Amino acid sequence: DTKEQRILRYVQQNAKPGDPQSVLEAIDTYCTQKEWAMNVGDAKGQIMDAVIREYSPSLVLELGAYCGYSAVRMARLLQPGARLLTMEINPDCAAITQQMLNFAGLQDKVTILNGASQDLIPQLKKKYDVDTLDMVFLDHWKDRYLPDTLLLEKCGLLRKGTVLLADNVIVPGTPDFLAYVRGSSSFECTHYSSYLEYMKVVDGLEKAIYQGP
Ligand SMILES: O=C(NCCCCc1cc2ccncc2s1)c1cc(-c2ccc(F)cc2)cc(O)c1O
Ligand SMILES: [Cl-]
Ligand SMILES: [Cl-]
Ligand SMILES: [Mg+2]
User: Fold this and answer.
1) Fewest Cβ atoms nearer than 10 Å: which of 80, 101, 108, 115?
2) Which domain covers residue 192, as residue numbers?
3) From the CA of 94, how far away is ligand 1's center (Å)?
4) Dihedral angle over CA of 55, 61, 63, 66, nearest 10
5) Can you give the CATH number for the domain in which 186 is found?
6) Of 87, 58, 81, 62, whose CA–CA distance to 73 is shortest?
């Protein structure tokens, strides 16, 4: 089996069904004690939580689900009726994410879209009945952060106040995205310095709030 399957099984055997906090703990324990994996982790997760609680978004888009750690993190804090759409290119990971959300009891809040962001973003309005997004979590290929931000704007999916929150802007890093949003009058940006998941290595989140054209 794969590392991702082992993380899912560990959750199934060491967390409580329907308890998202126990799911997060189990993943963080496994990834600390057994095998590193690219979940956002607890250090950066705490900053995500604070952001989610500040904005109480009704409709969140996530690029890059992986095993569902960030989707569980965000969905557990959503208000009733609020929704998360998460896009995952790897079908094995899409299936693990679905099972992770099922175990956590969050499946009614989250729709896991298996496919590439550059193919799926243009379908959001018509296919998934999206008007505009309240928040976007970027956690996919680091060289896609900038092109997908520009694609989101092109598609009319951003509104005044839409919050972009971007993982890994330091490690592995997303230099073009950071330079673009930080230099654009269409974004108000804040950096939240933290640590790479499960490591004593500096990383951070970028929050970039869209201001309109
Ligand atoms: O690559 C990372 N994350 C993206 C995986 C790409 C998955 C995709 C999902 C999807 C959905 C839709 N369209 C297209 C795509 S492409 C990543 C890597 C590290 C890291 C840090 C230090 C290391 F030494 C080694 C890895 C840490 C992280 O937190 C990451 O998130
Ligand atoms: Cl994650
Ligand atoms: Cl961590
Ligand atoms: Mg990441």
Assistant:
1) 80
2) 1-213
3) 14
4) 90
5) 3.40.50.150
6) 62
Helix (H, G, I), strand (E, B) or coil at 154: helix
Q: How was this structure determined?
A: X-ray
- Atom 14, ligand 1: residue with shortest CA distance: 116
Q: Whose CA is nearest to atom 8 of ligand 1?
A: 140
The answer to whether the beta carbons of residues 16 and 22 sit under 8 Å apart is: yes
Task: Locate 6 and state its tokens.
Answer: 């082992």
Give CA 126 to chain center in angstroms.
Answer: 22
H or E element that contains 85: strand 83-88
Closest by CA to 5, choosing from 42, 40, 35, is 35
Q: Where in the sequence numbering do the catalytic residues fall?
A: 139, 142, 167-168, 197
> Residue 64 corresponds to which tokens in the numbers above?
């890059």
3-state class of 187 per DSSP? strand
- Which residues does ligand 1 sit against, CB inside 6 Å? 38, 63-64, 87-89, 116-117, 139-141, 167-168, 171-172, 196-197
CA distances from 40 to 36, 68, 74, 161 (A): 11, 10, 11, 24
Neighbours of 133 (CB within 10 A): 22
Resolution of this deposited model, Å: 1.6
